[model samples]
Target: VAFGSEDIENTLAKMDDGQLDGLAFGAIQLDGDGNILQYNAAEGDITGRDPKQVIGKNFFKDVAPCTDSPEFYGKFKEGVASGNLNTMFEYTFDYQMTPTKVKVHMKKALSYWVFVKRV
Candidate 1:
């Protein structure tokens, strides 16, 4: 295992927050119903929310309503359903209004997905 069970759970919590925050173009995690299962530090920095607040919340639906679009959820569901993971992709983020450029990386490991972002 890349990390201990406890560590993985912590990471998932952080990533879920990142997804909800507009700062992250993407987040890595498990599609565990509505809670964030695995998150990272990058996601926390980008989102500006404490890891405590991010976890256990809907990544897009509740935290960041803006990203609750078809495209975002589509990709997430695709990866979760088929277990097909991705490396990285370039995209624009709705940073309030004007879009910003960013690159996101994702991968599935065991039951968790890892996400990283570069701006």
Candidate 2:
């Protein structure tokens, strides 16, 4: 693991909301069905949307439609289906009016796939 991958993995392993929200970067966790399980403060800051607005929603289909494309969501489902879930890529999030450049590190552990975004 490189960059913030190890820290992301560690946070997911720890699964503490306080620790997750404490990070300066954005961290979002989703279930196999794409339901948002965790949406921390950093993410709220970037998107200017409340965690309550998206926590139970689907990440790809609902909250972040910009990432609903094949390259992002498709590859994610592929990884989950195959049980080898680790994918990292650069993406520009243009949702809800904020066009932010971000690095997404998707790590599947437990029943969730944790996506940590570095700005």
Candidate 3:
């Protein structure tokens, strides 16, 4: 399904790791503290990072420090703290490879989920 589609959150909540990996957009599951829990193949492909290497790492500090900024990490902290993490916005990943523009959708289920699609 497309990013930001209606009922996308519900759709995602029901998907397993293999199912999520089949999506066209990136899907990442993280703990409240921003540690990577489940990193799907689409996300690995989007970021050019191996999911096997990133799992269990701190997403903000270690995996993607570029998101340590207020707009990204700060927003996540606020949502997780408030327990109302449904948010969508645009962001650019510019840490290592060529800058890529993406649409970010964050949602709170049993875990914090980050969905990304190239814009």
lDDT of 1 by residue, 34-93 (tens): 357545555666655556656677766765555556555556566667776454455555
Clashes of 1: 6
Q: Give the candidate number with the greatest lDDT.
A: 3
- lDDT pick, better of 1 and 3: 3
lDDT for predicted candidate 2 compared with the true structure: 0.77
What's the candidate order when arranged by decreasing TM-score? 3, 2, 1
In model 2, pairs of residues that clash are: none
Residue range 36-74, candidate 3, lDDT tens digits: 988999998878989888899999998898899899999
RMSD of candidates 1 onward, in order: 7.1, 2.3, 1.2
Model 2, position 38, has a per-residue lDDT of 86
| Residue 14, candidate 1: C-alpha displacement in angstroms | 16
Q: Estimate each model's TM-score.
A: 0.59, 0.86, 0.93
List runs of model 3 lying over 4 Å from the truth: none
Flag regions of model 2 displaced more than 4 Å: 1-3
lDDT tens digits, residues 42-114, model 2?
A: 8888777798778899988888899998878888898889987788888888888568888877777755554
As for TM-score, the candidate ahead, 1 or 2, is 2
- Give all candidates' CA lDDT scores: 0.52, 0.77, 0.89
Give the per-residue Cα lDDT of candidate 3 at 109.
69
